Amino acid sequence: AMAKDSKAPVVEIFDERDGCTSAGSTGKASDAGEKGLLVKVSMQKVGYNAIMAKSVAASYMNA
Amino acid sequence: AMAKDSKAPVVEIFDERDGCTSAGSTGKASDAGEKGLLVKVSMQKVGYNAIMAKSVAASYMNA
Amino acid sequence: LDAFSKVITSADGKAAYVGGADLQALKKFVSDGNKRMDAVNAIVSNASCIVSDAVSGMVCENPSLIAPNGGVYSNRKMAACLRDAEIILRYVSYSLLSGDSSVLEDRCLNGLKETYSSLGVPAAGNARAVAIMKATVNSFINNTAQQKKLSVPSGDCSALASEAGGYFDKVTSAIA
Amino acid sequence: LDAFSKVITSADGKAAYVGGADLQALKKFVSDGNKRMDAVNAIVSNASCIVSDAVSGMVCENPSLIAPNGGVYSNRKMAACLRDAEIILRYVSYSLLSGDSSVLEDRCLNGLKETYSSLGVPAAGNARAVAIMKATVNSFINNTAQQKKLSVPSGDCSALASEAGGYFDKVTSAIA
Numbered sequence A, B: 001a002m003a004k005d006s007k008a009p010v011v012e013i014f015d016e017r018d019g020c021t022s023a024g025s026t027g028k029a030s031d032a033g034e035k036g037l038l039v040k041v042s043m044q045k046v047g048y049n050a051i052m053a054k055s056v057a058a059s060y061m062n063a
Numbered sequence C, D: 001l002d003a004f005s006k007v008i009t010s011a012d013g014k015a016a017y018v019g020g021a022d023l024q025a026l027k028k029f030v031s032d033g034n035k036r037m038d039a040v041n042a043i044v045s046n047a048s049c050i051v052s053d054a055v056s057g058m059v060c061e062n063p064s065l066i067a068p069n070g071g072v073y074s075n076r077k078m079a080a081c082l083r084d085a086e087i088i089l090r091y092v093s094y095s096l097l098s099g100d101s102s103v104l105e106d107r108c109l110n111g112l113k114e115t116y117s118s119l120g121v122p123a124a125g126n127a128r129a130v131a132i133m134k135a136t137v138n139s140f141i142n143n144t145a146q147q148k149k150l151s152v153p154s155g156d157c158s159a160l161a162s163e164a165g166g167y168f169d170k171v172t173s174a175i176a
């Protein structure tokens, strides 16, 4: 059966081949043969977004 | 002289008068006389946003 | 494949980081391995756009959903709907990353029709939101959206766009 | 405004939460207290929209900025510019919350012209990004933007809108 924890796989694609790096750019995995490239996946709870909920309610008729 | 830490005051406005609350809706301050209303202010580092930087470079000609 | 299975089963927020030889192997065993990374990015980097536009279009085509006691009347129900749209969108993105829909079907879809039935979540609006996400994802994968663009080497991603559309079709069938 | 000055001076991520009697007092101490809360929300709840549209407009009006050796050439420089635009916008939003510009002037603007001059950050592009943010914020405070709307009690906010524009003018004057 489906989960009930409001969690979904958060996929993040990294392409730093232009050379711009930050602390998170090293140490997370080997880069051998795929310099600058990484796929990150983690399970995160998807929270309510009051600001977006209010915005849709007020703005939905504007494409 | 100006700071150099890339930090800015993050102002958050809360209006939960419709009755929908969450863990963060209590114990942050007394609500005496201003039920469901709160202003929050903190200093936070404004980080680089690679996704938005790439989006603007590719999309800036589209209003 | 075991790296993702570990962090998905634990569901504790620990991340799998796939680079180097692990990444070369990931792409080797799926079709269009590099283009698939771009297609996945085209979805996840636009998640908030996709979700807000789909739920907004669902309501503007059927404003009864936001009338009093409607499906998304009040901020709490609207927020839960936007949350659901993103939950679905992200399981589709993971399906496109992995090349199969098993986690989407097992963790997200299995029993979802019954859950929505009991809650009174209207399946017509639900299907329409999914259909708009499907069409929006299609444009982004093909880089044919009106405003937001993705810069990638020129070529044809029709196959990945069809595969993504098929994962959305699995959602539509589960939503009934 | 001593609670705000505390966490601004400390600049450590500590938050000031203002509710109840403190919030009633804050709203009477500033002018147009309740409208000012709405005007501030019109800025901060649209921060990403405001910043992305202003920097995009700066570039679409001068694409040399994104050519090699231009002010926002490469993702690194474009990202630093988007960062600065949000920094500036957020100090403007805090000025509108508090009803004065002291923190904006002292912590954000003092010496900023010399910083940009030493780096060669182009003043014309910078001024235009600020100008577009000013115009965008003006529409959001007055709820006259074409797509994103704010639902608030009907009334006039032109005093707050003028004040916000004045804070942008101090930015424009500072970066010359």
Ligand SMILES: */C=C\C1=C(C)C(=O)N/C1=C\c1[nH]c(/C=C2\N=C(C[C@H]3NC(=O)C(C(*)=C)=C3C)C(C)=C2CCC(=O)O)c(CCC(=O)O)c1C
Residues within 6 Å of the ligand: A060, A061, A062, A063, C048, C049, C050, C053, C054, C056, C057, C058, C060, C061, C131, C132, C135, C136, C137, C139, C140, C144, C145, C146, C147, C148
């Ligand atoms: C974040 C939004 C988008 C940006 C930025 C961008 O460049 N493209 C964006 C979205 C996008 N939308 C669609 C397709 C549809 N959006 C719909 C909702 C919209 N239409 C309405 O009538 C209302 C209510 C007034 C809305 C909020 C609808 C209905 C569609 C069509 C769905 C369908 O075909 O059945 C796309 C895909 C098409 C395109 O490339 O323009 C994108 C990319």
Ligand SMILES: */C=C\C1=C(C)C(=O)N/C1=C\c1[nH]c(/C=C2\N=C(C[C@H]3NC(=O)C(C(*)=C)=C3C)C(C)=C2CCC(=O)O)c(CCC(=O)O)c1C
Residues within 6 Å of the ligand: B060, B061, B062, B063, D048, D049, D050, D053, D054, D056, D057, D058, D060, D061, D131, D132, D135, D136, D137, D139, D140, D144, D145, D146, D147, D148
């Ligand atoms: C997040 C964006 C917005 C939503 C959603 C919305 O409802 N309004 C939004 C933005 C907004 N922009 C402006 C004004 C300007 N935007 C500009 C940039 C745009 N124009 C271009 O020529 C290009 C490049 C092709 C762009 C990316 C510009 C130049 C302006 C005008 C600035 C000026 O007046 O000097 C506003 C304010 C006007 C309005 O309400 O429409 C908003 C609200």
Ligand SMILES: *[C@@H](C)[C@H]1/C(=C/c2[nH]c(/C=C3N=C(/C=C4\NC(=O)C(CC)=C4C)C(C)=C\3CCC(=O)O)c(CCC(=O)O)c2C)NC(=O)[C@@H]1C
Residues within 6 Å of the ligand: A047, A048, A049, A050, A051, A053, B014, B015, B016, B020, B021, B022, B023, B024, B025, B026, B027, B028, B029, B030, B031, B035, B036, B037, B038, B040, C075, C076, C079, D017, D018, D019, D020
């Ligand atoms: C219901 C699910 C709706 C919703 C709520 C929601 N609120 C927050 C976060 C915060 N809410 C407040 C508000 C208050 N805190 C107080 O102490 C008081 C009284 C004085 C109020 C009015 C605050 C301060 C926060 C932030 C908490 C913090 O900074 O630590 C969230 C986010 C999660 C959380 O609980 O922190 C959510 C989801 N959101 C919706 O979309 C529904 C419409």
Ligand SMILES: *[C@@H](C)[C@H]1/C(=C/c2[nH]c(/C=C3N=C(/C=C4\NC(=O)C(CC)=C4C)C(C)=C\3CCC(=O)O)c(CCC(=O)O)c2C)NC(=O)[C@@H]1C
Residues within 6 Å of the ligand: A014, A016, A019, A020, A021, A022, A023, A024, A025, A026, A027, A028, A029, A030, A031, A035, A036, A037, A038, A040, B047, B048, B049, B050, B051, B053, C017, C018, C019, C020, D075, D076, D079
């Ligand atoms: C330069 C300022 C540009 C920029 C960089 C930037 N990157 C991140 C975050 C991450 N980058 C990676 C990429 C890798 N990590 C690795 O080990 C490898 C080699 C195999 C790669 C390719 C990852 C995984 C992250 C996320 C880190 C995490 O999961 O914790 C950031 C965010 C801040 C940070 O340092 O984590 C930034 C700012 N961003 C820009 O806008 C510039 C274009």
Ligand SMILES: *[C@@H](C)[C@H]1/C(=C/c2[nH]c(/C=C3N=C(/C=C4\NC(=O)C(CC)=C4C)C(C)=C\3CCC(=O)O)c(CCC(=O)O)c2C)NC(=O)[C@@H]1C
Residues within 6 Å of the ligand: A013, A014, A015, A034, A037, A038, A039, C023, C032, C034, C035, C036, C037, C038, C039, C041, C141, C142, C143, C152, C153, C154, C155, C156, C157, C160
């Ligand atoms: C449909 C999605 C669109 C499209 C894509 C397209 N991409 C390529 C080539 C490459 N894409 C990447 C991207 C990545 N590889 C990674 O490992 C990661 C991180 C996880 C990313 C982001 C790479 C490396 C390539 C190879 C070429 C290069 O080095 O840049 C192509 C070219 C064909 C191919 O299969 O290589 C195409 C066509 N193009 C479009 O026009 C669509 C909108």
Ligand SMILES: *[C@@H](C)[C@H]1/C(=C/c2[nH]c(/C=C3N=C(/C=C4\NC(=O)C(CC)=C4C)C(C)=C\3CCC(=O)O)c(CCC(=O)O)c2C)NC(=O)[C@@H]1C
Residues within 6 Å of the ligand: B013, B014, B015, B037, B038, B039, D023, D027, D032, D034, D035, D036, D037, D038, D039, D041, D042, D141, D142, D143, D152, D153, D154, D155, D156, D157, D160
């Ligand atoms: C210009 C910004 C626009 C506008 C604003 C406007 N607002 C009100 C009235 C109120 N606004 C609030 C909002 C808050 N108070 C808080 O403490 C918080 C959290 C920090 C918020 C979000 C409140 C409480 C009121 C009072 C009425 C009510 O209870 O709802 C008015 C009415 C006049 C007045 O001064 O009260 C106006 C005009 N209206 C527009 O049309 C502009 C686009």
Ligand SMILES: *[C@H](C)[C@H]1/C(=C/c2[nH]c(/C=C3N=C(/C=C4\NC(=O)C(CC)=C4C)C(C)=C\3CCC(=O)O)c(CCC(=O)O)c2C)NC(=O)[C@@H]1C
Residues within 6 Å of the ligand: A002, A003, A004, A005, A006, A007, A008, C055, C058, C065, C070, C071, C072, C077, C078, C080, C081, C082, C084, C085, C087, C088, C107, C108, C112, C115, C119, C121, C122, C123, C124, C125, C126, C127, C129
């Ligand atoms: C949005 C297009 C539509 C909509 C959505 C809506 N959904 C709910 C409530 C729930 N949604 C789920 C879905 C999941 N939970 C999970 O953990 C997962 C997988 C990881 C999924 C897919 C569940 C379980 C619920 C019930 C529990 C909960 O509220 O979180 C609501 C709230 C319904 C209510 O009346 O309380 C809404 C509004 N509603 C629409 O009208 C759209 C068609």
Ligand SMILES: *[C@H](C)[C@H]1/C(=C/c2[nH]c(/C=C3N=C(/C=C4\NC(=O)C(CC)=C4C)C(C)=C\3CCC(=O)O)c(CCC(=O)O)c2C)NC(=O)[C@@H]1C
Residues within 6 Å of the ligand: B002, B003, B004, B005, B006, B007, B008, D055, D065, D070, D071, D072, D077, D078, D080, D081, D082, D084, D085, D087, D088, D107, D108, D109, D112, D115, D119, D121, D122, D123, D125, D126, D127, D129
């Ligand atoms: C965007 C509209 C324009 C632009 C911006 C840009 N800025 C920098 C570099 C810096 N910006 C600042 C500004 C601040 N730092 C702070 O801490 C604060 C207050 C809290 C402010 C206002 C500083 C100090 C720098 C230098 C240090 C740093 O980079 O962080 C750059 C990078 C310049 C370079 O050549 O490396 C850019 C690109 N550039 C444009 O072209 C637009 C007009």
